[PDB]
Amino acid sequence: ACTKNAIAQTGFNKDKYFNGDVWYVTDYLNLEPDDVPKRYCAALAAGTASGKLKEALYHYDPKTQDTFYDVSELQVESLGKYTANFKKVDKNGNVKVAVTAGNYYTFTVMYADDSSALIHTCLHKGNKDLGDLYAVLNRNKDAAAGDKVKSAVSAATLEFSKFISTKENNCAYDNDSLKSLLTK
Numbered sequence: 001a002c003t004k005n006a007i008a009q010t011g012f013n014k015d016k017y018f019n020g021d022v023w024y025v026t027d028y029l030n031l032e033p034d035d036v037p038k039r040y041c042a043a044l045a046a047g048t049a050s051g052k053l054k055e056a057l058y059h060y061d062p063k064t065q066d067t068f069y070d071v072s073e074l075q076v077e078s079l080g081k082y083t084a085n086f087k088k089v090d091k092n093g094n095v096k097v098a099v100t101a102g103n104y105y106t107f108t109v110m111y112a113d114d115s116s117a118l119i120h121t122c123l124h125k126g127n128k129d130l131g132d133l134y135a136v137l138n139r140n141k142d143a144a145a146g147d148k149v150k151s152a153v154s155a156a157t158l159e160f161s162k163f164i165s166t167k168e169n170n171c172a173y174d175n176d177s178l179k180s181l182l183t184k
């Protein structure tokens, strides 16, 4: 179960975050033990497509090679805080698992600037019992976390030393699919 009401960034700039471009997860923190593997790759695109607020996600386990994409329309709870009902799709946007009630994630942007961000998500998926996940994002897949975002991790009362890096997994991303998925 999730336990955090994450606080959105004061003065969050939604148009800059949701500009159609790609964010890479460089470091993550799962609050519950063994919720997720200790080696993992993930990225997203975020933008408005034909007036609709969207995200496209990519997950890849670099050991098992398990891979999946998702597309969601985000609904607004408050500035920087969203609820997303997801559909699993192939990289071209063809539906593999349709939107269904009870399959949704919340998504809070705790900190963002033009290059980096800190987000929280609570995933709900059928009768999985998952816990809070925080992720440091960057526009550059290889970027070490700078002081702006590390300070935000501290301000959230978290220890950056506990976050697991994704950088030693040889992650390669299909940015073109992520951007085109925003329309799907």
Ligand code: HEM
Residues within 6 Å of the ligand: 025, 028, 035, 036, 037, 039, 040, 041, 042, 043, 044, 057, 059, 068, 069, 070, 086, 087, 088, 097, 104, 105, 107, 121, 123, 125, 128, 133, 135
């Ligand atoms: C960018 C932030 C992230 C978001 C918004 C997110 C969202 C999601 C969503 C929506 C699903 C279910 C997809 C589906 O079934 O169609 C999922 C599943 C999963 N995610 Fe993430 N994820 C993020 C980052 C990560 C990271 C960094 C990890 C590290 C391991 C991770 C591990 C997983 C795993 C293992 C599953 C499979 C869950 C299961 O079915 O048991 N995710 N995530």
